[PDB]
Design a protein around this ligand. Structure first.
Ligand SMILES: c1cc(-c2cnn3cc(-c4ccc(OCCN5CCCCC5)cc4)cnc23)ccn1
Length: 267
């Protein structure tokens, strides 16, 4: 365009996010104008931290992902200085920004979106070569108001969005040994809570109250929230990882199972 901003059949445009190993830009197919999200991974930075083998395993794994609520990877072009991962672009932006701008979602809508998000999470638990911790900010919305999660491993490029940072599951901030899948449940309870209440369940610019609040596990349940969904939020936000719901427990909860497509949880 103005310069060397074309790669393959694509033209690169504005930066949407920055990550450890590079950045993600909006792109467009040069013949059709169709938008894509191009993660550009800086291979010298990869060599620097000596994670060449892990990056390649992750890219190879992600090439084969196929799930209706995970951003697709269309193509990978590698050059001596970068890998370009041409990915699906989704127009709705990030779920938390949406909620922030429009406030809470109606309950049925919260449940639709929640069932899509947890199916994608479960698929990642099953397929990521290495488990890494879900990042709530990676949950995005497509043009049809459906959830789409952007990959959140080493090549995660998800960077910022709005206003209302210090935030993690109880056992993580207490500096205890922990298991990724259990912390992911807690993070999904924070996502469900924000869809239903239009706020985070622990809010607090004072980073000690916040943390005490988190390990304390005290959260507000608005009057309009029913009790069948209140029990789910409580079992997902259990401070004690050994007491916290698993994905199977969520699957059997009455509020969740309502009107749930089977192809979302095969087995
Ligand atoms: C990281 C990010 C992505 C990615 C794919 N699509 N995509 C889309 C966006 C995006 C981000 C912000 C957007 O803003 C839309 C405008 N509104 C206004 C504010 C409230 C909701 C959003 C729209 C789209 C961001 N990242 C991605 C893909 C892979 N890795």
């Amino acid at each position: 365009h103005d310069g060397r901003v074309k790669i393959g059949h694509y033209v690169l445009g504005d930066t949407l996010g920055v990550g450890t190993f590079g950045k993600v830009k909006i792109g467009e197919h040069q013949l059709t104008g169709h938008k894509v999200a191009v993660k550009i991974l800086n291979r010298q930075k990869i060599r620097s931290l000596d994670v060449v083998g892990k990056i390649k395993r992750e890219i190879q794994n992600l090439k084969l992902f196929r799930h209706p609520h995970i951003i697709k990877l269309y193509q990978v072009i590698s050059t001596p200085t970068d890998f370009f991962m041409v990915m699906e672009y989704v127009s709705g932006g990030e779920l938390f920004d949406y909620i922030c701008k429009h406030g809470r979602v109606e309950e049925m809508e919260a449940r639709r979106l929640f069932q899509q998000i947890l199916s994608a999470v479960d698929y990642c638990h099953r397929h990521m070569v290495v488990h890494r911790d879900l990042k709530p900010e990676n949950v995005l919305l497509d043009a049809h108001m459906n959830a789409k999660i952007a990959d959140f491993g080493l090549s995660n490029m998800m960077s910022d969005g709005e206003f209302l940072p210090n935030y993690a599951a109880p056992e993580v901030i207490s500096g205890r040994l922990y298991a990724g899948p259990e912390v992911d449940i807690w993070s999904c309870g924070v996502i469900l809570y924000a869809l239903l209440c239009g706020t985070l369940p622990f809010d607090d610019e004072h980073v000690p109250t916040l943390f005490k609040k988190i390990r304390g596990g005290v959260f507000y349940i608005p009057e309009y929230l029913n009790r069948s969904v209140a029990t789910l939020l409580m079992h997902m936000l259990q401070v004690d990882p050994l007491k916290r719901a698993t994905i199977k427990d969520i699957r059997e909860h009455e509020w969740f199972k309502q009107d749930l497509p089977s192809y979302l949880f095969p087995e």
